[PDB]
Amino acid sequence: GATAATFSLSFLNSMQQNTGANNIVATNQNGYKPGDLVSYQINNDGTVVGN
Amino acid sequence: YSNEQEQVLGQIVLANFANNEGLASQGDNVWAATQASGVALLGTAGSGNF
């Protein structure tokens, strides 16, 4: 009984030029799962980042 | 035991304060929680804040 999710997948920058066999270069999405706060650190640029 | 049986007597919990350096040192190598130190925040030793 959750909510149906809709997303978009892009095939941009994909070249089929007989580069051996089927291959994958990079793959990513913007659907990060929730996580738990491990640690925090201070960068040299002045921002605070939570990991 | 003598019959190839496994029993658990418990596990040791971990108390990780969100804000260290505020625990008052007492006795020998023990700390007593106080104000501006947070709760113990008990939990397992698997992952997370432990």
Q: Strand B14-15 and strand B42-43: pairing?
A: antiparallel
d(CA B43, CA A46): 32
Cα distances (Å, whole numbers) of residue B35 to B28, B31, B39: 21, 13, 9
The resolution in angstroms reads 3.2
Shortest Cα distance, chain A CAs vs residue B32, angstroms: 23
d(CA B49, CA A34): 15
User: Exposed (0-12), middle (13-18) or buried (19+): which is B48, by Cβ within 10 Å?
Assistant: middle
CA A13 from chain centre, in angstroms, equals 16
Sign of the CA dihedral with A33 first, then A38, B40, and A42 last: negative
Method by which the model was determined = cryo-EM
CB contacts under 8 A, B 1-50 vs A, are 47-49
Please tell me the number of Cα atoms within 13 Å of A7 on its side-chain side: 9
CA B40 from chain centre, in angstroms, equals 7
Strand locations in chain B (E): 14-15, 24-26, 30-32, 42-43
Q: Which residues of A touch B18 (CB under 8 A)?
A: none
Q: Which residues of A touch B49 (CB under 8 A)?
A: 36-38
